Amino acid sequence: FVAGQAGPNYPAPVEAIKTIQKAANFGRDKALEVEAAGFAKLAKTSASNCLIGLFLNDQELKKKAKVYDKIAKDVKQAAVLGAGIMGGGIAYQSASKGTPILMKDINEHGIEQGLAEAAKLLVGRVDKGRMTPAKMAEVLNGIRPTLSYGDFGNVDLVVEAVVENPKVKQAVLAEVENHVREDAILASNTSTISISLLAKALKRPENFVGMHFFNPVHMMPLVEVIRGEKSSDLAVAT
Amino acid sequence: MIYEGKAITVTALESGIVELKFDLKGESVNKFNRLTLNELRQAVDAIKADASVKGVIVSSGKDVFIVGADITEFVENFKLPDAELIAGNLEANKIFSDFEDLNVPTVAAINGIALGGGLEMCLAADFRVMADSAKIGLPEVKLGIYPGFGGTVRLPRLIGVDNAVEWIASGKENRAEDALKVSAVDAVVTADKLGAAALDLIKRAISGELDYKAKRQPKLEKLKLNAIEQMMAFETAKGFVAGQAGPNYPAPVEAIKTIQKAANFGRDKALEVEAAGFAKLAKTSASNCLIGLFLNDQELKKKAKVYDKIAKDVKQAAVLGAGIMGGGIAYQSASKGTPILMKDINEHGIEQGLAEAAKLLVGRVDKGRMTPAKMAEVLNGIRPTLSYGDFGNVDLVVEAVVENPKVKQAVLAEVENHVREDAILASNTSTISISLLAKALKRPENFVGMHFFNPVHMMPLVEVIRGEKSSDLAVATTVAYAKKMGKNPIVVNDCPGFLVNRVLFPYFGGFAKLVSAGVDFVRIDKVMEKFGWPMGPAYLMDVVGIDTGHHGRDVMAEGFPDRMKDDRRSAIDALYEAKRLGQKNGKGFYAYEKKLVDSSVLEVLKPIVYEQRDVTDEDIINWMMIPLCLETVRCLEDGIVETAAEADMGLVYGIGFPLFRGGALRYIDSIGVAEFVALADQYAELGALYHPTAKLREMAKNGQSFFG
Numbered sequence: 001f002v003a004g005q006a007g008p009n010y011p012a013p014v015e016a017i018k019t020i021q022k023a024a025n026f027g028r029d030k031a032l033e034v035e036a037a038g039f040a041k042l043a044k045t046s047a048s049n050c051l052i053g054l055f056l057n058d059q060e061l062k063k064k065a066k067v068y069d070k071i072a073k074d075v076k077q078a079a080v081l082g083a084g085i086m087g088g089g090i091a092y093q094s095a096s097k098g099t100p101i102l103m104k105d106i107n108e109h110g111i112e113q114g115l116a117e118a119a120k121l122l123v124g125r126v127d128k129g130r131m132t133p134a135k136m137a138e139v140l141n142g143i144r145p146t147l148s149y150g151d152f153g154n155v156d157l158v159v160e161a162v163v164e165n166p167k168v169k170q171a172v173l174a175e176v177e178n179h180v181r182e183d184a185i186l187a188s189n190t191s192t193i194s195i196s197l198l199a200k201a202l203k204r205p206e207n208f209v210g211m212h213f214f215n216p217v218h219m220m221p222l223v224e225v226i227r228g229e230k231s232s233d234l235a236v237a238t
Numbered sequence: 239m240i241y242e243g244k245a246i247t248v249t250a251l252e253s254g255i256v257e258l259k260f261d262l263k264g265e266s267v268n269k270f271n272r273l274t275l276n277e278l279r280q281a282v283d284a285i286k287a288d289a290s291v292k293g294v295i296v297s298s299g300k301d302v303f304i305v306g307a308d309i310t311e312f313v314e315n316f317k318l319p320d321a322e323l324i325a326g327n328l329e330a331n332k333i334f335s336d337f338e339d340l341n342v343p344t345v346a347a348i349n350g351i352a353l354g355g356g357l358e359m360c361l362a363a364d365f366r367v368m369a370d371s372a373k374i375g376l377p378e379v380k381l382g383i384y385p386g387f388g389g390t391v392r393l394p395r396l397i398g399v400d401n402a403v404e405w406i407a408s409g410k411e412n413r414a415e416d417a418l419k420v421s422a423v424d425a426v427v428t429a430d431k432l433g434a435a436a437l438d439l440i441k442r443a444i445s446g447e448l449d450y451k452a453k454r455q456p457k458l459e460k461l462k463l464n465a466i467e468q469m470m471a472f473e474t475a476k477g478f479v480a481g482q483a484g485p486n487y488p489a490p491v492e493a494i495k496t497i498q499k500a501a502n503f504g505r506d507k508a509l510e511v512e513a514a515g516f517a518k519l520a521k522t523s524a525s526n527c528l529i530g531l532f533l534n535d536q537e538l539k540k541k542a543k544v545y546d547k548i549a550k551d552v553k554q555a556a557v558l559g560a561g562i563m564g565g566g567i568a569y570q571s572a573s574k575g576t577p578i579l580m581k582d583i584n585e586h587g588i589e590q591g592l593a594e595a596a597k598l599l600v601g602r603v604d605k606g607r608m609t610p611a612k613m614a615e616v617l618n619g620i621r622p623t624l625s626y627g628d629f630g631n632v633d634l635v636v637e638a639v640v641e642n643p644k645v646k647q648a649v650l651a652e653v654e655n656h657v658r659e660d661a662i663l664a665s666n667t668s669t670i671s672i673s674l675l676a677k678a679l680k681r682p683e684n685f686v687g688m689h690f691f692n693p694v695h696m697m698p699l700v701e702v703i704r705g706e707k708s709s710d711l712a713v714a715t716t717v718a719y720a721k722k723m724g725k726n727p728i729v730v731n732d733c734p735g736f737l738v739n740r741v742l743f744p745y746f747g748g749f750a751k752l753v754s755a756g757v758d759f760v761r762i763d764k765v766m767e768k769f770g771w772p773m774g775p776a777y778l779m780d781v782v783g784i785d786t787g788h789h790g791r792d793v794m795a796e797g798f799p800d801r802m803k804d805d806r807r808s809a810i811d812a813l814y815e816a817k818r819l820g821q822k823n824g825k826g827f828y829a830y831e832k833k834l835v836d837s838s839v840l841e842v843l844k845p846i847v848y849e850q851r852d853v854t855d856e857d858i859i860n861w862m863m864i865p866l867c868l869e870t871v872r873c874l875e876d877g878i879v880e881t882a883a884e885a886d887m888g889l890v891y892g893i894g895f896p897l898f899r900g901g902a903l904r905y906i907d908s909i910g911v912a913e914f915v916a917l918a919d920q921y922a923e924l925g926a927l928y929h930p931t932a933k934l935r936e937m938a939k940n941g942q943s944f945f946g
């Protein structure tokens with residue numbers, strides 16, 4: 001079982017089993033010897049020090065994390081432009097982690113897809129005992145569909161996830177900017193367009209950055225926060 | 239063909255198999271009216287005479303299988319003398335029995351709805367094949383009666399006492415799935431294979447593969463149950479049904495008594511027991527009042543069609559204010575397939591609204607009554623907000639803000655500039671004038687009242703209030719929207735207290751006069767509860783809240799000084815001034831920990847007890863009922879409501895008027911207009927609330943009635 005799940009490239013799991021199997025009929029002291037021998041062996045493997053190196057990387061990232069947090073402004077209210085694949089995925093994630101978010105779009109159909117998917121995921125978890133019906137309620141109530149900017153007044157960070165078109169993005173980005181606080185951060189989820197290019201359509205580029213997620217938003221761990229030439233440390237940190 | 243009528247046809251098929259099909263030409267459904275019964279007699283005799291017949295398949299040519307006859311004939315039939323009624327039923331049952339005694343296999347092919355007589359026809363056959371989309375059941379109890387064509391005889395012998403009782407005492411429709419599990423039916427197939435399944439089954443009966451005689455036998459003999467098991471089954475059935483239907487509903491218990499009396503009998507004797515009980519029930523006052531409710535509903539449905547001719551469907555709705563009513567309205571709207579915006583002024587307000595919508599949805603899922611996926615659809619339907627940014631395409635906006643004229647007039651005027659100029663605006667107000675609120679608007683023709691009752695998801699009634707400027711379109715649209723939300727709307731012209739509250743207070747007045755007369759309030763509502771009221775006056779006042787009743791009284795007193803203004807302090811004043819606000823407050827007439835009698839109230843009420851007048855239970859009922867009934871009559875005469883049906887159903891849905899009594903106006907009809915007027919005068923000393931109207935006295939003499 002462990003073999004077909006860890007893979008041939010991960011010695012640790014199988015060795016632990018081999019150690020317990022070798023010590024099966026032994027008392028404490030002999031069983032410890034079997035443990036020690038296998039331990040020494042693993043500690044010298046390439047898989048082990050590369051895994052330990054990931055841990056060291058994480059530590060480094062956490063130190064930079066503390067620096068970012070010294071200035072990062074908490075996002076109490078978020079907003080995402082565009083529902084659907086990425087937009088809806090972003091809404092789901094934000095709401096799922098304790099951050100109310102507005103799901104803006106241009107037509108009812110767009111909001112349908114967004115809400116539909118957020119539902120399938122939430123329902124899926126409850127249909128698997130991994131989530132409380134009450135929790136599913138909290139998440140959904142966190143997502144607030146809309147087709148206007150009437151409630152953007154107190155949004156701290158807006159994520160633009162519209163069609164991959166420079167002209168379109170520059171228009172929308174410029175538009176939303178006139179509907180949020182002037183200290184609100186704006187971000188684009190674009191994967192092939194220049195953040196510094198998009199920022200030129202704005203009057204407050206210092207607050208514009210890239211927040212690149214990966215499909216499916218709820219699955220992929222990575223988010224590339226892109227710093228444009230004008231992107232302020234605050235915009236990035238936040 | 240073997241037989242060709244206007245309701246039934248008997249066409250020969252292969253291998254001697256014959257098909258008796260129901261298709262009432264010219265009508266939309268099949269039903270056992272006089273014509274069909276007569277033709278069934280002939281069809282049966284024709285088959286009984288054709289020695290070449292090897293089997294019979296009973297089918298339908300309509301979308302339904304067979305439903306009940308027109309309520310109209312029920313009314314007529316039940317006017318006949320017991321001897322005639324019973325003789326007529328003996329004759330009908332003879333037809334079904336003769337079909338059941340055919341010395342040939344029989345199968346009923348249930349394609350659609352088969353209710354009452356329709357199901358009874360099916361029970362008469364040897365086998366029953368049902369389409370997975372069809373439904374069957376015996377709704378007789380709804381009319382205050384019970385199965386009259388062998389239903390109480392065949393169903394118990396086919397699916398067992400417990401299950402037969404459950405079907406008959408509830409009158410519920412049963413889906414194919416459930417019908418197969420209790421064996422009311424023998425097979426369930428898709429609509430496209432119903433014909434082939436019936437044909438296949440019949441052949442297997444003819445070949446002897448299926449012993450149709452053995453399958454028929456059970457309904458021709460006594461039940462299989464022990465004397466001991468019978469006692470257990472019947473006594474628990476009576477016990478359970480008793481504390482659930484109430485003492486005022488004979489039908490459910492009689493059906494059980496009938497099955498118990500016939501337990502050891504074969505078909506014919508069991509039919510006799512059934513017939514006798516049936517005749518008895520058909521003459522009860524409960525039955526014709528229940529049947530009258532049905533007639534009222536039919537009237538409402540005809541007005542429904544007229545409203546729908548112009549009513550604009552509400553694709554997108556909006557409610558101003560979350561919280562108790564606002565959130566409740568949002569929940570309902572979203573729960574019935576209509577997206578709705580929940581607007582408020584502060585996040586806390588939206589919290590409460592969303593919180594409650596959640597508790598309800600979660601509650602249903604936490605009891606397998608709702609799918610987690612469905613709960614998602616509902617919640618996504620409610621869209622919280624604090625601006626009017628999305629109101630652009632709203633078709634109807636319901637205002638459910640604080641009870642303050644100033645506030646409402648401001649908000650209403652504000653939203654009007656954020657919606658289409660053809661959007662309907664409605665207020666959920668219970669004590670403010672719709673025509674007054676409409677003056678703050680520039681498009682009053684589109685303003686009406688849409689009055690819901692707490693808790694919005696529980697209360698069936700919705701009073702659509704027409705202001706003096708309210709257009710028929712505005713009213714029609716609001717009506718249809720209420721129906722879509724699963725409510726029962728009744729149009730009422732603007733007036734203090736509208737229809738429901740305006741009628742309730744004269745009722746509470748009488749209660750106030752009783753308490754001021756030294757009558758024990760615990761005895762009072764015990765009497766009114768026995769009368770049929772869900773809750774007694776005192777207890778109801780608590781649930782509603784003394785503070786609420788205090789305010790209401792003031793509004794009505796201002797509204798109709800000539801009869802609702804009292805120049806003496808009542809128990810309401812004593813409890814309010816004493817801060818005994820009701821159930822919510824923890825103390826009112828009773829004490830709540832839940833409902834308890836606490837003598838500490840005696841002191842509070844003492845100052846109110848003027849005389850120590852002695853009274854009978856019958857007087858108590860009249861002190862309460864006469865004011866309520868007369869005020870209803872006034873509403874009809876004032877034109878607050880157009881028809882008696884509307885007024886009575888308004889009280890049935892919004893006040894919980896005892897169903898077996900039909901309504902306030904129908905109650906007067908039961909007592910007798912002349913008799914009621916006479917009765918009223920007897921209490922003329924109590925005030926203007928007990929004074930009959932000229933129009934009433936007039937119809938009292940002309941032998942006129944509200945429904946007769």
Ligand SMILES: NC(=O)c1ccc[n+]([C@@H]2O[C@H](COP(=O)([O-])OP(=O)(O)OC[C@H]3O[C@@H](n4cnc5c(N)ncnc54)[C@H](O)[C@@H]3O)[C@@H](O)[C@H]2O)c1
Binds near residue numbers: 162
């Ligand atoms: N292949 C992927 O799935 C993927 C991976 C990474 C990054 N991205 C990025 O995500 C963005 C596209 O997201 P998508 O995959 O959901 O595409 P999509 O077409 O499925 O979604 C676009 C949504 O935005 C809505 N929209 C359009 N104009 C709008 C406006 N002015 N305001 C608000 N909503 C508007 C549309 O109606 C639609 O619902 C692009 O920037 C793309 O580079 C996509």
Ligand SMILES: NC(=O)c1ccc[n+]([C@@H]2O[C@H](COP(=O)([O-])OP(=O)(O)OC[C@H]3O[C@@H](n4cnc5c(N)ncnc54)[C@H](O)[C@@H]3O)[C@@H](O)[C@H]2O)c1
Binds near residue numbers: 586649669
């Ligand atoms: N007993 C009842 O609960 C009942 C029964 C029938 C009808 N009504 C009617 O319902 C209305 C009151 O409803 P309620 O009992 O839920 O009151 P409530 O106090 O429980 O809720 C009022 C909500 O409206 C919000 N609000 C206040 N001003 C607002 C504005 N200008 N715009 C938008 N939202 C605003 C408040 O913040 C609050 O969330 C009244 O008109 C009353 O007559 C109440």
Ligand SMILES: CCCCCCCCOCCOCCOCCOCCOCCO
Binds near residue numbers: 266270376
């Ligand atoms: C035989 C057992 C009956 C069971 C009791 C249930 C009651 C069912 O009876 C229904 C009869 O309804 C009578 C109404 O007929 C009036 C026709 O209305 C005219 C409107 O036409 C619309 C047709 O869709």
Ligand SMILES: CCCCCCCCOCCOCCOCCOCCOCCO
Binds near residue numbers: 891
């Ligand atoms: C002053 C505030 C007003 C409060 C009034 C509410 C008090 C009423 O409470 C009673 C609960 O109402 C129950 C409604 O009963 C439902 C009706 O049953 C439907 C059957 O209709 C037959 C149709 O054929």
Ligand SMILES: [Zn+2]
Binds near residue numbers: 788811
């Ligand atoms: Zn007072």
